[PDB]
Amino acid sequence: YPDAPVALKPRFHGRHVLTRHPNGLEKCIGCSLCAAACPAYAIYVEPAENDPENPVSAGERYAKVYEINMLRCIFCGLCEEACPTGAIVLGYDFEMADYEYSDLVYGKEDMLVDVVGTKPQRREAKRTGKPVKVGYVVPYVRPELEGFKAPTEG
Amino acid sequence: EREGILFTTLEKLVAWGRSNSLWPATFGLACCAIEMMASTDARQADVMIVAGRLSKKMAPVMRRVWEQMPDPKWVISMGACASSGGMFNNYAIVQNVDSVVPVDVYVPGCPPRPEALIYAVMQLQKKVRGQAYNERGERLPPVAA
Amino acid sequence: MVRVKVNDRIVEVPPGTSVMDAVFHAGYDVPLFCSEKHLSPIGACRMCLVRIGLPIQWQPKLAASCVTAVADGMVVDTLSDVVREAQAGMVEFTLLNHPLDCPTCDKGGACELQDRTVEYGLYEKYELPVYTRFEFTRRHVDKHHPLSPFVILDRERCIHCKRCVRYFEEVPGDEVLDFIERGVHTFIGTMDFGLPSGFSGNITDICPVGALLDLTARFRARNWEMEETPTTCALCPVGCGITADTRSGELLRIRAREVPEVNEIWICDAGRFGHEWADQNRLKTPLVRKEGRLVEATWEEAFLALKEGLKEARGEEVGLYLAHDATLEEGLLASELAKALKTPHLDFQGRTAAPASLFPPASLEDLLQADFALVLGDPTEEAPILHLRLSEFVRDLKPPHRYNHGTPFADLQIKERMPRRTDKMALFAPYRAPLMKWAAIHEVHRPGEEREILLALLGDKEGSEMVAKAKEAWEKAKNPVLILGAGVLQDTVAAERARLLAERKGAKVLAMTPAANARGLEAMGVLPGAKGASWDEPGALYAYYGFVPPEEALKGKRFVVMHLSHLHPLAERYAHVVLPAPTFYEKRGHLVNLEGRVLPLSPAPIENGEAEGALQVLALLAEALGVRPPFRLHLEAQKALKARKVPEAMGRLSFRLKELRPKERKGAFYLRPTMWKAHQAVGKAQEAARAELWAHPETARAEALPEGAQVAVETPFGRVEARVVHREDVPKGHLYLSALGPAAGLRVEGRVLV
Amino acid sequence: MRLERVLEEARAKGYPIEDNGLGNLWVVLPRERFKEEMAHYKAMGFNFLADIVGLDYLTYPDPRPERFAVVYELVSLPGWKDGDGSRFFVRVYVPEEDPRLPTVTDLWGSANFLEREVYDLFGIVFEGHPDLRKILTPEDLEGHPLRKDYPLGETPTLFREGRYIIPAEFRAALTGKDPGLTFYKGGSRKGYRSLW
Amino acid sequence: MTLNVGGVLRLMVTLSGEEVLEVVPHIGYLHTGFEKTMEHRTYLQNITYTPRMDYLHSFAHDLAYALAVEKLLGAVVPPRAETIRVILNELSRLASHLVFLGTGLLDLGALTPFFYAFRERETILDLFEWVTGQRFHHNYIRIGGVKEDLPEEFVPELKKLLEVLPHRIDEYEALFAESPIFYERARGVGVIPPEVAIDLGLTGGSLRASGVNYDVRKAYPYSGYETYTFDVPLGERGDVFDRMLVRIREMRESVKIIKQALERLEPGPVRDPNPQITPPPRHLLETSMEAVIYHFKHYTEGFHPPKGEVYVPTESARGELGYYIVSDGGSMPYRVKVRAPSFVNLQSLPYACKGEQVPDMVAIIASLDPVMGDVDR
Amino acid sequence: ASSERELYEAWVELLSWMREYAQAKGVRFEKEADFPDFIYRMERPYDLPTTIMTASLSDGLGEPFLLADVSPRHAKLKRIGLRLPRAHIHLHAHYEPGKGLVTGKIPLTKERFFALADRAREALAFA
Numbered sequence A: 001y002p003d004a005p006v007a008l009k010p011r012f013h014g015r016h017v018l019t020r021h022p023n024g025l026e027k028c029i030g031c032s033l034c035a036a037a038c039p040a041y042a043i044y045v046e047p048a049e050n051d052p053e054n055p056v057s058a059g060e061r062y063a064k065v066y067e068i069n070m071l072r073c074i075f076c077g078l079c080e081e082a083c084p085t086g087a088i089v090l091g092y093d094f095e096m097a098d099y100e101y102s103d104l105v106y107g108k109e110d111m112l113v114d115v116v117g118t119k120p121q122r123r124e125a126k127r128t129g130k131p132v133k134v135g136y137v138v139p140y141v142r143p144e145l146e147g148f149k150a151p152t153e154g
Numbered sequence B: 001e002r003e004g005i006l007f008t009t010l011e012k013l014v015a016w017g018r019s020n021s022l023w024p025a026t027f028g029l030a031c032c033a034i035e036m037m038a039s040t041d042a043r044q045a046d047v048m049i050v051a052g053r054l055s056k057k058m059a060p061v062m063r064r065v066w067e068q069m070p071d072p073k074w075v076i077s078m079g080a081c082a083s084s085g086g087m088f089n090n091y092a093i094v095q096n097v098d099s100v101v102p103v104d105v106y107v108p109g110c111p112p113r114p115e116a117l118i119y120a121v122m123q124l125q126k127k128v129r130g131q132a133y134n135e136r137g138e139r140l141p142p143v144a145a
Numbered sequence C: 001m002v003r004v005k006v007n008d009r010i011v012e013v014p015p016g017t018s019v020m021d022a023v024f025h026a027g028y029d030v031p032l033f034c035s036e037k038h039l040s041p042i043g044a045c046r047m048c049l050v051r052i053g054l055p056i057q058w059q060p061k062l063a064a065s066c067v068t069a070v071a072d073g074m075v076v077d078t079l080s081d082v083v084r085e086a087q088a089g090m091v092e093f094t095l096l097n098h099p100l101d102c103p104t105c106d107k108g109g110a111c112e113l114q115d116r117t118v119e120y121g122l123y124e125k126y127e128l129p130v131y132t133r134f135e136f137t138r139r140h141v142d143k144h145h146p147l148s149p150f151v152i153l154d155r156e157r158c159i160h161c162k163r164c165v166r167y168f169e170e171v172p173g174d175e176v177l178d179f180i181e182r183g184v185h186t187f188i189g190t191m192d193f194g195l196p197s198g199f200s201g202n203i204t205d206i207c208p209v210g211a212l213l214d215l216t217a218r219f220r221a222r223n224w225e226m227e228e229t230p231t232t233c234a235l236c237p238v239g240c241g242i243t244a245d246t247r248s249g250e251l252l253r254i255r256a257r258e259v260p261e262v263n264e265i266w267i268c269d270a271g272r273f274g275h276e277w278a279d280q281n282r283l284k285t286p287l288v289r290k291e292g293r294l295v296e297a298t299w300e301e302a303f304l305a306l307k308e309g310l311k312e313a314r315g316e317e318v319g320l321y322l323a324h325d326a327t328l329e330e331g332l333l334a335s336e337l338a339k340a341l342k343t344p345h346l347d348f349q350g351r352t353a354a355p356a357s358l359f360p361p362a363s364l365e366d367l368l369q370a371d372f373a374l375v376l377g378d379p380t381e382e383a384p385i386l387h388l389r390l391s392e393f394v395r396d397l398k399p400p401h402r403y404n405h406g407t408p409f410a411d412l413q414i415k416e417r418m419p420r421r422t423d424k425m426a427l428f429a430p431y432r433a434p435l436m437k438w439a440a441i442h443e444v445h446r447p448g449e450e451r452e453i454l455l456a457l458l459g460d461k462e463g464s465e466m467v468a469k470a471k472e473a474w475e476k477a478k479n480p481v482l483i484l485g486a487g488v489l490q491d492t493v494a495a496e497r498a499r500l501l502a503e504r505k506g507a508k509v510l511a512m513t514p515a516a517n518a519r520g521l522e523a524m525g526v527l528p529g530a531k532g533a534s535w536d537e538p539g540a541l542y543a544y545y546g547f548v549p550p551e552e553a554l555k556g557k558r559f560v561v562m563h564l565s566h567l568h569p570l571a572e573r574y575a576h577v578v579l580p581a582p583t584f585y586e587k588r589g590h591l592v593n594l595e596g597r598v599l600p601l602s603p604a605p606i607e608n609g610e611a612e613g614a615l616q617v618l619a620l621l622a623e624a625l626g627v628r629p630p631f632r633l634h635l636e637a638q639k640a641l642k643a644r645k646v647p648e649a650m651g652r653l654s655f656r657l658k659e660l661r662p663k664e665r666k667g668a669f670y671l672r673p674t675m676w677k678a679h680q681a682v683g684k685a686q687e688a689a690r691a692e693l694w695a696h697p698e699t700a701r702a703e704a705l706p707e708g709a710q711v712a713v714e715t716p717f718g719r720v721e722a723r724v725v726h727r728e729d730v731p732k733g734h735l736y737l738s739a740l741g742p743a744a745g746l747r748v749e750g751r752v753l754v
Numbered sequence D: 001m002r003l004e005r006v007l008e009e010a011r012a013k014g015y016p017i018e019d020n021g022l023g024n025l026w027v028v029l030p031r032e033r034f035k036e037e038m039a040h041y042k043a044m045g046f047n048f049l050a051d052i053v054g055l056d057y058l059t060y061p062d063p064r065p066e067r068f069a070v071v072y073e074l075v076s077l078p079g080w081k082d083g084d085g086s087r088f089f090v091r092v093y094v095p096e097e098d099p100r101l102p103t104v105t106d107l108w109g110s111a112n113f114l115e116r117e118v119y120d121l122f123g124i125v126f127e128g129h130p131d132l133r134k135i136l137t138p139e140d141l142e143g144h145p146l147r148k149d150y151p152l153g154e155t156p157t158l159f160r161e162g163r164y165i166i167p168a169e170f171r172a173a174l175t176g177k178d179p180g181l182t183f184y185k186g187g188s189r190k191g192y193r194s195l196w
Numbered sequence E: 001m002t003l004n005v006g007g008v009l010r011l012m013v014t015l016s017g018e019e020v021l022e023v024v025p026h027i028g029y030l031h032t033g034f035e036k037t038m039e040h041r042t043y044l045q046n047i048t049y050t051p052r053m054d055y056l057h058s059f060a061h062d063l064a065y066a067l068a069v070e071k072l073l074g075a076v077v078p079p080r081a082e083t084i085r086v087i088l089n090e091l092s093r094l095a096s097h098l099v100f101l102g103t104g105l106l107d108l109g110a111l112t113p114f115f116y117a118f119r120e121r122e123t124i125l126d127l128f129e130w131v132t133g134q135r136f137h138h139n140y141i142r143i144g145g146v147k148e149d150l151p152e153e154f155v156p157e158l159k160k161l162l163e164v165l166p167h168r169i170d171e172y173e174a175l176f177a178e179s180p181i182f183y184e185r186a187r188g189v190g191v192i193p194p195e196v197a198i199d200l201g202l203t204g205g206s207l208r209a210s211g212v213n214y215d216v217r218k219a220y221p222y223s224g225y226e227t228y229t230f231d232v233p234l235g236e237r238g239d240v241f242d243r244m245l246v247r248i249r250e251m252r253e254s255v256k257i258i259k260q261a262l263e264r265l266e267p268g269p270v271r272d273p274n275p276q277i278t279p280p281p282r283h284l285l286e287t288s289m290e291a292v293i294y295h296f297k298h299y300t301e302g303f304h305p306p307k308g309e310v311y312v313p314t315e316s317a318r319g320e321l322g323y324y325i326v327s328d329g330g331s332m333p334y335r336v337k338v339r340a341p342s343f344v345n346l347q348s349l350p351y352a353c354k355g356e357q358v359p360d361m362v363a364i365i366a367s368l369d370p371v372m373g374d375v376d377r
Numbered sequence F: 001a002s003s004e005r006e007l008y009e010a011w012v013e014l015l016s017w018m019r020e021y022a023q024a025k026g027v028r029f030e031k032e033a034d035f036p037d038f039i040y041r042m043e044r045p046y047d048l049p050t051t052i053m054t055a056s057l058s059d060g061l062g063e064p065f066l067l068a069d070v071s072p073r074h075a076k077l078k079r080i081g082l083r084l085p086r087a088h089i090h091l092h093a094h095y096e097p098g099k100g101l102v103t104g105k106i107p108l109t110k111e112r113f114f115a116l117a118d119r120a121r122e123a124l125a126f127a
């Protein structure tokens, strides 16, 4: 029924999203805890020092590289759990089947809250010129995914 | 002649053709086997769908099933265990089904939602059309071979 | 030995043992914050509290197990509620003002505070548990403020163990750190800004928390995320034990590895911060010259082009020249290859005119139990860690008892702020050496002049009063040790006399070779023959190089294969076939220490590229000449060393050798032996590795050299720009050049271009 | 109750009894006496052979008698004629060089598959088993996986720019016999246990 | 005549004639290696590996391992935890029985009764997605209790499905008891001797289908099953007819349990607050250093339970299930062996269909209810 | 009270003075650390004027000569603090309704601050 969107529960385990505070700062402080807690060794994090002039996160430290191998990932949300800032939270998207193995490792700007759709969903709507129709809807956005705009009309 | 319009528009019609004569021939294994039965129930075969942990013992077996198939054929890989080494990174499992059969589409999840297996063949579909590319931006060959 | 009952276990243990080490030896445990392997115990933080009974009669107040000695028939309770409750509290106090950085803190899961916090903290009494009682404003101060380019200090974290400051006054002897105000307000600070001593890096490895941190590797990976690779630093002859942290093929950080036999748990800065270069710019594909320029080529292509330059070659004109840090295997192979391939000129980069195998190797153990130290050279540069053992030596310290847990936590032997004896050592060198401070008998000479001082010592001449007090010291010397380095080992005259002085008195010697694996390559026979052509002598016609030689030795030769690791300009202008080689970090094989000890080399998972070790390249260049080599890989090369009867790891290889090939000294400039190596000048090490140029202010300004000028200088070893420094300790009219290489201890012609 | 009679007996006969506070109790039998003594157990009313599980103590901190060791779990099902509920385990340390051990197929038919598994994963043979054939591991798997010196066989996980992760060198977790990332480990991370 | 017929289970059916000589099974095709890799994971991390063996009544696996570790390092599961943990356990047991009952509806043709059972199941799985955010393999059971509390919309929806099921389970018992074809199809075949079953270890609730009264939830009570309105279904003679009914009878009872536990569901804590076993309440991570330290440590290198060896039996829909864990005082277990009920159950199969017809050999294995991820693992 | 709110407001100010003096007399201002109760704040709310909690006016070598900090929102006995490192001088500034920012009875005005900063800079800076 890909003509009429699927209704997932608020708590569903979908493509990971990286959240921000209202300040515009990335919540994530490049600590690599999420990765350390992963049962499938599916996260790689390279940290880096903030620039006091042009910040990124609040700490002295932020995540330069944040990558998640969406094939290995088992979707436990152990990472969301271990995170001590609430930066990584499990999103809603699931329409993310793709073609070449390595195209399935999601990068930082593939996961920020201000992103719409998945790596392949977007890529199509790029060479298409037609916006992204997400095949899902929910009762409401979780509190924890604060900022994440999605089809919620219930 | 091969690159002319006459040949192209033919093969572009041919492809568009079996782009719909797609005959999903499931090959389920563990838990994934039970989430695919929730999509084939909602509604000679090409397109085998690997859904679950491919043991090393089970490997040379799925291999034969694939060989003895038509020639215009495709392989979707269902979820972590099929796609990647899954979360079982050990002696007992193959770390990518591409090690034994060529995969045309991978579908992340564990098990991937049923509705995602739908979207997954849609991708396979829209690729045998030769109407699909990767992130680098290259046109992708409709068949794995 | 003494009878001591820990909890339920009873243990024998020497008389002057720490109650702490008692406990750990029995196989128990206690919160440990301020005490440290090799540093004076003081009962500072008060974590290692225990209860003690001694007749059973229970002592009234808990004791600091780290500073209370064991007595016969002593019970030490480390489990009573009374005890846990106390540790629990002490931990609470330590955490009371701490800063809450963990996730962001570079101390990762390798932090003594965290671990003990979790280990003993939060007391179980016998409802909603309370994680924190203290609800007031924490102590806020300075943060992430770098003391030097290599150490970044975070005052807020510090817990006021005395480890760092204590270390400084004790091991190196360079007090450049110490608490400031008092009470809750005290903190770590300095007024000697650069962090002078060549041994600062160690405070990074001692600091229980994230206050003192390795800036060279700030914010790269968390401590578990790293791939540790235990191995040996081969920058100099002492072969300390290191661990190399690597992640995703790049080298992130270097640390000390405990190896008490040789270097203890210490590492000089050059060894620990000079890793900037290895994983950065590097030659990754063999090059061969096509049209008067070098171009990438497959090893297949190279091998053929190699065959070509050597088809027309008589097997005696072949030259083999290894690098100062050539493995024991690479040396043995190159030996036989020059044996079958009948040639006279095979040498190794750092080769001393006087073979270090001359003198009987002396253990670092021996050095502590010797009764005098006669030094002719600057240990602080030639073989750094020696300085630190001599620090233990000048304190009359002697190798601690080994316990069930190895090297002891609280050695009561070591008292804080000890007195240093200046009668236990004599120091002679071309400048005001650093260790001249703990040397009563001490004098400054001029370049290549040790020959006369060594003579005088023998008894065949009159030297200064100093040399005289030195003679009479060495005379009244019961079981002394001779430490000698560059000048001495590089001039046949002196070198010979040194050996004599050390034969007559039954004493051992420390060869401060400028070649890392000198004592090891000498044991394999990588020494030039009758003919001549040595590593700086342009003799041979077709030669293999494991390093960039003096420009003079290249110019002329018919065919040159340079097995470098980085592209030197001298190569891309004189080299015919350049092949990529691994650094000692990513090699495999054994080395021979300056004490004759043989130390292993493991391979770090760094980015080799398409390179291979000289073990292959040699064998490959052996085919294009004639005979098939005897060595393929390591597993098989091992057989040929175990053949020659060279001991396994850690063993010491005894091997003497009486033969010396002299050469004249063109005394204009003196390449002053330095800790840092030339090829290290990258990143943060960029400055600490720049060459220098010293001279006496008269002759300095008489040859027109301002006190802070950037000058260009030319030696037979190359043109280098160096800072210029005035020094009243520099003999009149000579110029001391930073001999950043292994060509140190040499007098050379040359001049200051303008 | 049929268990007290096992204990009152083992007590007299130099059979060491293990017991953890949680409700599980063992009884080590030496090599020889095992065979027969166990038959005697079933004869005593021990219906059902629940599990059997091989253990390899090679990487265990505190030393043990012999390297491998096998546990069995004999029981009297409470749904039958005169079943109490008397469950218990029995152990036998099997020499690193003599992987031999008498089957129990004789009295229990459950040991058929179960003994096969313990042969498959650890190197342990069983004297007189109908067919000692590999149960779980592919035919051509050389050796025995479940034992501590047999590589778990891991592949580095892959990421974009040649970023890899060899799990073995990445794990933050500590393997009991492992000293930890600091000099050592002590306190409530050498082992913890709350008090009811 | 040896015919090589081969869920993901291969059978060597030696067979000259139309009888059945000996059936020689060959498994190993879903050998994922759990027992080995769990020796290389946090005790927390292992909770994601446990539901991937019996992917149908997985929660029973979760609880079986949780209980073994809980006791080992001695933790106490709150009131509301234990309650949720059976509401969760049995709700999953219904899911594994709905499948078994559903595959027996097809082999009986009854096709609208099936189009219902597959909807029931999905309604249960909807519940698992409400609370645990997953269809299955739910990371919900924690060593102290449960990851987080249940949502507002769990109690309501569980009422909907806990209201239409009462008589509905009888409708399923109806069709199979008023056996048109069924009588002649199962009533005799698959002879399970009450005293040979207790020799091969056929403990899986298909034990009692053949006349034994050994249910572990009563015999050796665990998560408070000791305190419930509990009926253990019984079978007369060990055929397959009884085995299809017993398992339907079990649903009747598991539903009573859910209803009964749902009554004592008063608000409170969800995991043991003991800091050495449980991460610090999320919220104070902005104040307590001790909190930051514990949290940072807890999720990097997990906790260390004492040295020792424990085991505790539970009962999944497929019988006795237990984890035998060997702790060496590390962050990870030293050994984990799993008592796979479907593994020992499978030894009662050569005998099961001994000398029977061959077209009967499908519903003969399916009436033993093996799950391959269980046997193989 | 809601005087708490006004304290932080003033702390924002104290910082603005610091940044001013910094770029003014040609000497480095540095945010030393941000509130932990912000960094690790998650879905939880936050309505404080800044994230910056510890600040310094450091010299050429980086060694601070002035150190200011305010107490985190979740703490007790709140105060904004001044500290001249190395010279044992600690000032605790409170907040009184209508009077303003005070160190006891004496007001802490931009003037008085700038004075303190200088005394320190001139006598305590290493480079």
Ligand code: SF4
Residues within 6 Å of the ligand: A034, A037, A038, A039, A040, A041, A042, A043, A068, A072, A073, A074, A075, A076, A077, A078, A079, A080
């Ligand atoms: S959901 Fe699980 S597998 Fe995926 S990144 Fe998070 S912890 Fe790793």
Ligand code: SF4
Residues within 6 Å of the ligand: A027, A028, A029, A030, A031, A032, A033, A034, A035, A045, A063, A082, A083, A084, A085, A086, A087, A088
């Ligand atoms: S997402 Fe969270 S746990 Fe992961 S690195 Fe960022 S702050 Fe740390």
Ligand code: SF4
Residues within 6 Å of the ligand: B029, B030, B031, B032, B033, B051, B052, B053, B078, B079, B080, B081, B082, B086, B109, B110, B111, B112, E052
């Ligand atoms: S990918 Fe997940 S659901 Fe699918 S077989 Fe593997 S563990 Fe089971």
Ligand code: SF4
Residues within 6 Å of the ligand: C098, C099, C100, C101, C102, C103, C105, C106, C107, C108, C111, C112, C113, C114, C157, C208, C209, C210, C211, E293
């Ligand atoms: S020194 Fe240790 S306890 Fe303190 S913040 Fe750093 S990692 Fe945490």
Ligand code: SF4
Residues within 6 Å of the ligand: C157, C158, C159, C160, C161, C162, C163, C164, C165, C188, C206, C207, C208, C209, C211, C212
């Ligand atoms: S900086 Fe580190 S080593 Fe020095 S006193 Fe502070 S805690 Fe100890």
Ligand code: SF4
Residues within 6 Å of the ligand: C233, C234, C235, C236, C237, C238, C239, C240, C263, C267, C268, C269, C270, C271, C272, C383, C384, C385
């Ligand atoms: S003293 Fe020598 S071996 Fe030791 S760390 Fe320094 S250069 Fe390396």
Ligand code: FES
Residues within 6 Å of the ligand: C031, C032, C033, C034, C035, C042, C043, C044, C045, C046, C047, C048, C049, C064, C065, C066, C067
């Ligand atoms: S008191 Fe600090 S270790 Fe003994």
Ligand SMILES: [Ca+2]
Residues within 6 Å of the ligand: C250, C251, C252, C275, C276, C279, C280
């Ligand atoms: Ca580097």
Ligand SMILES: [Ca+2]
Residues within 6 Å of the ligand: D161
């Ligand atoms: Ca990189």
Ligand SMILES: [Ca+2]
Residues within 6 Å of the ligand: C142, C143, C144, C145, F030, F058, F062, F063, F064
């Ligand atoms: Ca500063």
